[PDB]
């Protein structure tokens, strides 16, 4: 509850940063797989991968301030974001989000 | 009622048309997975792989009780021509052909 005007600006920032980082990494993966595709089973493994990733990406980047404390905590736990990049938020948030990365 | 060698010419025509479509698919999934630029390109590739996995799994039903319908489809899709089924009884070919026209 309660997000400043610039807290909202630094939130969108850290969101789009971790977002772009993960998309690009995905973009490389789908490329680096086009090489080792020999059998049809390799295509099914690519389909399965695109399924799992699409489901995670569509539901993980939920820009909703009421759960955005949990979203950021995940990204931190996955390396797509560090507390250093959320610099600008109130302190209970930074302290809270941190405690949630290791939970 | 399928002969002993009708079964062999069936396996032949089946897996050949299969290879043509699988090989062609492997090229598409390769050529497209490379030219991906934005994220929207990956979701479109995902949708394609979804529809194809569903179509391919249900397209190649090697079941002699419906294999008259499977072959007729492949012919309507270019993965096979009646010329390649010429080992079958002249009466099946007439049926299979008529289903290509539907």
mmCIF file of C-alpha atoms in Angstrom:
data_model
loop_
_atom_site.group_PDB
_atom_site.id
_atom_site.type_symbol
_atom_site.label_atom_id
_atom_site.label_comp_id
_atom_site.label_asym_id
_atom_site.label_seq_id
_atom_site.Cartn_x
_atom_site.Cartn_y
_atom_site.Cartn_z
ATOM 1 C CA UNK A 1 0.000 0.000 0.000
ATOM 2 C CA UNK A 2 1.065 3.596 -0.780
ATOM 3 C CA UNK A 3 3.449 4.173 -3.706
ATOM 4 C CA UNK A 4 5.049 7.547 -4.430
ATOM 5 C CA UNK A 5 5.030 9.252 -7.821
ATOM 6 C CA UNK A 6 8.705 8.456 -8.351
ATOM 7 C CA UNK A 7 8.395 5.060 -6.686
ATOM 8 C CA UNK A 8 5.998 4.343 -9.560
ATOM 9 C CA UNK A 9 8.597 5.633 -12.022
ATOM 10 C CA UNK A 10 11.449 3.554 -10.573
ATOM 11 C CA UNK A 11 9.077 0.559 -10.479
ATOM 12 C CA UNK A 12 8.228 0.677 -14.184
ATOM 13 C CA UNK A 13 11.969 1.065 -14.815
ATOM 14 C CA UNK A 14 13.111 -2.004 -12.863
ATOM 15 C CA UNK A 15 10.187 -3.934 -14.352
ATOM 16 C CA UNK A 16 11.063 -3.226 -17.986
ATOM 17 C CA UNK A 17 14.754 -3.800 -17.273
ATOM 18 C CA UNK A 18 14.376 -7.304 -15.833
ATOM 19 C CA UNK A 19 11.716 -7.934 -18.485
ATOM 20 C CA UNK A 20 13.981 -7.040 -21.414
ATOM 21 C CA UNK A 21 16.847 -9.013 -19.869
ATOM 22 C CA UNK A 22 14.744 -12.188 -19.744
ATOM 23 C CA UNK A 23 13.200 -11.737 -23.196
ATOM 24 C CA UNK A 24 16.602 -11.272 -24.842
ATOM 25 C CA UNK A 25 17.937 -14.356 -23.053
ATOM 26 C CA UNK A 26 14.915 -16.236 -24.384
ATOM 27 C CA UNK A 27 15.549 -14.777 -27.850
ATOM 28 C CA UNK A 28 19.065 -16.222 -27.754
ATOM 29 C CA UNK A 29 17.855 -19.632 -26.536
ATOM 30 C CA UNK A 30 15.349 -20.093 -29.355
ATOM 31 C CA UNK A 31 18.138 -19.185 -31.797
ATOM 32 C CA UNK A 32 20.806 -21.398 -30.192
ATOM 33 C CA UNK A 33 18.326 -24.287 -30.500
ATOM 34 C CA UNK A 34 17.704 -23.977 -34.253
ATOM 35 C CA UNK A 35 21.187 -25.493 -34.696
ATOM 36 C CA UNK A 36 20.794 -28.730 -32.719
ATOM 37 C CA UNK A 37 17.387 -29.520 -34.277
ATOM 38 C CA UNK A 38 17.953 -32.832 -36.082
ATOM 39 C CA UNK A 39 15.038 -35.146 -35.216
ATOM 40 C CA UNK A 40 11.362 -34.215 -34.933
ATOM 41 C CA UNK A 41 11.600 -34.920 -31.197
ATOM 42 C CA UNK A 42 13.836 -31.836 -30.969
ATOM 43 C CA UNK A 43 10.947 -29.723 -32.271
ATOM 44 C CA UNK A 44 8.572 -31.125 -29.652
ATOM 45 C CA UNK A 45 11.142 -30.292 -26.975
ATOM 46 C CA UNK A 46 11.178 -26.750 -28.377
ATOM 47 C CA UNK A 47 7.373 -26.637 -28.318
ATOM 48 C CA UNK A 48 7.307 -27.827 -24.705
ATOM 49 C CA UNK A 49 9.903 -25.189 -23.820
ATOM 50 C CA UNK A 50 7.954 -22.394 -25.516
ATOM 51 C CA UNK A 51 4.877 -23.579 -23.613
ATOM 52 C CA UNK A 52 6.483 -23.508 -20.165
ATOM 53 C CA UNK A 53 8.176 -20.170 -20.837
ATOM 54 C CA UNK A 54 5.094 -18.471 -22.292
ATOM 55 C CA UNK A 55 3.077 -19.517 -19.241
ATOM 56 C CA UNK A 56 5.713 -18.215 -16.826
ATOM 57 C CA UNK A 57 6.307 -14.952 -18.694
ATOM 58 C CA UNK A 58 2.626 -14.109 -19.180
ATOM 59 C CA UNK A 59 1.899 -14.593 -15.475
ATOM 60 C CA UNK A 60 5.165 -13.494 -13.879
ATOM 61 C CA UNK A 61 5.252 -9.927 -15.258
ATOM 62 C CA UNK A 62 2.039 -8.831 -13.547
ATOM 63 C CA UNK A 63 2.430 -5.062 -13.161
ATOM 64 C CA UNK A 64 0.015 -4.823 -10.235
ATOM 65 C CA UNK A 65 1.205 -2.698 -7.313
ATOM 66 C CA UNK A 66 -0.781 -4.902 -4.905
ATOM 67 C CA UNK A 67 1.437 -7.900 -5.790
ATOM 68 C CA UNK A 68 4.421 -6.029 -7.276
ATOM 69 C CA UNK A 69 6.353 -6.627 -4.045
ATOM 70 C CA UNK A 70 6.176 -10.369 -4.748
ATOM 71 C CA UNK A 71 6.977 -9.975 -8.458
ATOM 72 C CA UNK A 72 10.163 -8.018 -7.748
ATOM 73 C CA UNK A 73 11.164 -10.523 -5.058
ATOM 74 C CA UNK A 74 10.967 -13.330 -7.621
ATOM 75 C CA UNK A 75 13.084 -11.542 -10.238
ATOM 76 C CA UNK A 76 15.712 -10.971 -7.543
ATOM 77 C CA UNK A 77 15.614 -14.692 -6.686
ATOM 78 C CA UNK A 78 16.145 -15.485 -10.388
ATOM 79 C CA UNK A 79 18.969 -13.044 -11.168
ATOM 80 C CA UNK A 80 16.913 -10.945 -13.607
ATOM 81 C CA UNK A 81 17.086 -8.090 -11.072
ATOM 82 C CA UNK A 82 19.083 -7.027 -8.012
ATOM 83 C CA UNK A 83 17.979 -4.940 -5.038
ATOM 84 C CA UNK A 84 20.575 -2.413 -6.204
ATOM 85 C CA UNK A 85 18.320 -1.659 -9.186
ATOM 86 C CA UNK A 86 15.234 -0.996 -7.034
ATOM 87 C CA UNK A 87 17.165 1.905 -5.490
ATOM 88 C CA UNK A 88 14.611 4.647 -4.931
ATOM 89 C CA UNK A 89 11.819 2.776 -3.183
ATOM 90 C CA UNK A 90 10.925 3.221 0.471
ATOM 91 C CA UNK A 91 12.994 1.207 2.917
ATOM 92 C CA UNK A 92 10.405 -1.235 4.260
ATOM 93 C CA UNK A 93 9.908 -2.262 0.617
ATOM 94 C CA UNK A 94 13.600 -2.871 -0.101
ATOM 95 C CA UNK A 95 13.933 -4.659 3.239
ATOM 96 C CA UNK A 96 10.712 -6.606 2.602
ATOM 97 C CA UNK A 97 11.494 -7.559 -1.003
ATOM 98 C CA UNK A 98 14.937 -8.734 0.099
ATOM 99 C CA UNK A 99 13.490 -11.001 2.785
ATOM 100 C CA UNK A 100 11.179 -12.459 0.128
ATOM 101 C CA UNK A 101 13.942 -13.371 -2.342
ATOM 102 C CA UNK A 102 15.295 -15.952 0.136
ATOM 103 C CA UNK A 103 11.882 -17.455 0.953
ATOM 104 C CA UNK B 1 -9.264 -56.637 -45.956
ATOM 105 C CA UNK B 2 -5.640 -55.713 -46.712
ATOM 106 C CA UNK B 3 -3.192 -58.011 -48.501
ATOM 107 C CA UNK B 4 0.222 -59.062 -47.188
ATOM 108 C CA UNK B 5 2.004 -56.804 -49.687
ATOM 109 C CA UNK B 6 -0.706 -54.140 -49.619
ATOM 110 C CA UNK B 7 0.428 -53.731 -46.013
ATOM 111 C CA UNK B 8 4.013 -53.254 -47.217
ATOM 112 C CA UNK B 9 3.102 -50.675 -49.873
ATOM 113 C CA UNK B 10 1.053 -48.947 -47.159
ATOM 114 C CA UNK B 11 3.974 -48.659 -44.731
ATOM 115 C CA UNK B 12 6.064 -47.376 -47.645
ATOM 116 C CA UNK B 13 3.656 -44.663 -48.795
ATOM 117 C CA UNK B 14 2.921 -43.766 -45.169
ATOM 118 C CA UNK B 15 6.459 -43.133 -43.924
ATOM 119 C CA UNK B 16 7.567 -41.491 -47.180
ATOM 120 C CA UNK B 17 4.813 -38.865 -47.091
ATOM 121 C CA UNK B 18 5.668 -38.615 -43.393
ATOM 122 C CA UNK B 19 9.337 -37.882 -44.112
ATOM 123 C CA UNK B 20 8.385 -35.274 -46.723
ATOM 124 C CA UNK B 21 6.213 -33.415 -44.211
ATOM 125 C CA UNK B 22 8.565 -33.831 -41.235
ATOM 126 C CA UNK B 23 11.641 -32.794 -43.226
ATOM 127 C CA UNK B 24 9.743 -29.787 -44.585
ATOM 128 C CA UNK B 25 8.682 -28.952 -41.029
ATOM 129 C CA UNK B 26 12.255 -29.160 -39.733
ATOM 130 C CA UNK B 27 13.265 -26.545 -42.319
ATOM 131 C CA UNK B 28 10.450 -24.181 -41.340
ATOM 132 C CA UNK B 29 11.107 -24.419 -37.594
ATOM 133 C CA UNK B 30 14.800 -23.854 -38.318
ATOM 134 C CA UNK B 31 14.375 -20.993 -40.806
ATOM 135 C CA UNK B 32 11.919 -19.262 -38.464
ATOM 136 C CA UNK B 33 13.612 -19.806 -35.093
ATOM 137 C CA UNK B 34 16.560 -17.890 -36.574
ATOM 138 C CA UNK B 35 14.737 -14.849 -37.956
ATOM 139 C CA UNK B 36 13.019 -14.171 -34.615
ATOM 140 C CA UNK B 37 13.563 -10.560 -33.520
ATOM 141 C CA UNK B 38 10.846 -9.415 -31.081
ATOM 142 C CA UNK B 39 9.070 -11.533 -28.461
ATOM 143 C CA UNK B 40 5.944 -11.579 -30.635
ATOM 144 C CA UNK B 41 7.966 -13.756 -33.022
ATOM 145 C CA UNK B 42 8.399 -16.461 -30.372
ATOM 146 C CA UNK B 43 4.699 -16.651 -29.487
ATOM 147 C CA UNK B 44 3.768 -16.939 -33.166
ATOM 148 C CA UNK B 45 6.300 -19.759 -33.498
ATOM 149 C CA UNK B 46 4.793 -21.355 -30.389
ATOM 150 C CA UNK B 47 1.287 -21.218 -31.875
ATOM 151 C CA UNK B 48 2.558 -22.789 -35.099
ATOM 152 C CA UNK B 49 4.281 -25.610 -33.209
ATOM 153 C CA UNK B 50 1.072 -26.122 -31.219
ATOM 154 C CA UNK B 51 -1.203 -26.500 -34.247
ATOM 155 C CA UNK B 52 1.315 -28.709 -36.077
ATOM 156 C CA UNK B 53 1.905 -31.074 -33.155
ATOM 157 C CA UNK B 54 -1.867 -31.533 -32.921
ATOM 158 C CA UNK B 55 -2.285 -31.980 -36.686
ATOM 159 C CA UNK B 56 0.690 -34.337 -37.078
ATOM 160 C CA UNK B 57 -0.223 -36.542 -34.113
ATOM 161 C CA UNK B 58 -3.734 -37.068 -35.463
ATOM 162 C CA UNK B 59 -2.790 -37.053 -39.133
ATOM 163 C CA UNK B 60 -0.548 -40.133 -39.076
ATOM 164 C CA UNK B 61 -2.890 -42.665 -37.480
ATOM 165 C CA UNK B 62 -1.536 -45.936 -38.856
ATOM 166 C CA UNK B 63 -4.780 -47.850 -38.401
ATOM 167 C CA UNK B 64 -5.907 -49.951 -41.364
ATOM 168 C CA UNK B 65 -9.529 -49.337 -40.346
ATOM 169 C CA UNK B 66 -9.110 -45.607 -41.108
ATOM 170 C CA UNK B 67 -5.990 -45.746 -43.299
ATOM 171 C CA UNK B 68 -8.215 -45.236 -46.350
ATOM 172 C CA UNK B 69 -9.105 -41.787 -44.994
ATOM 173 C CA UNK B 70 -5.556 -40.902 -43.916
ATOM 174 C CA UNK B 71 -4.065 -41.517 -47.365
ATOM 175 C CA UNK B 72 -6.883 -39.596 -49.063
ATOM 176 C CA UNK B 73 -6.043 -36.588 -46.886
ATOM 177 C CA UNK B 74 -2.294 -36.676 -47.617
ATOM 178 C CA UNK B 75 -3.102 -36.708 -51.341
ATOM 179 C CA UNK B 76 -5.299 -33.624 -50.907
ATOM 180 C CA UNK B 77 -2.316 -31.982 -49.149
ATOM 181 C CA UNK B 78 0.400 -32.748 -51.711
ATOM 182 C CA UNK B 79 2.461 -34.968 -49.397
ATOM 183 C CA UNK B 80 1.426 -37.879 -51.640
ATOM 184 C CA UNK B 81 -0.003 -38.589 -55.085
ATOM 185 C CA UNK B 82 -2.210 -41.488 -56.181
ATOM 186 C CA UNK B 83 0.673 -42.585 -58.421
ATOM 187 C CA UNK B 84 2.546 -43.780 -55.315
ATOM 188 C CA UNK B 85 -0.277 -46.017 -54.009
ATOM 189 C CA UNK B 86 -0.383 -48.081 -57.229
ATOM 190 C CA UNK B 87 0.452 -51.266 -55.288
ATOM 191 C CA UNK B 88 -2.994 -51.365 -53.661
ATOM 192 C CA UNK B 89 -6.057 -53.098 -55.052
ATOM 193 C CA UNK B 90 -7.582 -51.173 -57.944
ATOM 194 C CA UNK B 91 -10.754 -50.877 -55.845
ATOM 195 C CA UNK B 92 -9.082 -49.097 -52.922
ATOM 196 C CA UNK B 93 -7.404 -46.549 -55.205
ATOM 197 C CA UNK B 94 -10.835 -45.618 -56.574
ATOM 198 C CA UNK B 95 -12.116 -45.073 -53.027
ATOM 199 C CA UNK B 96 -9.030 -43.197 -51.803
ATOM 200 C CA UNK B 97 -9.177 -41.020 -54.914
ATOM 201 C CA UNK B 98 -12.839 -40.165 -54.394
ATOM 202 C CA UNK B 99 -12.017 -39.013 -50.858
ATOM 203 C CA UNK B 100 -9.281 -36.737 -52.184
ATOM 204 C CA UNK B 101 -12.169 -35.001 -53.968
ATOM 205 C CA UNK B 102 -13.901 -34.171 -50.668
#
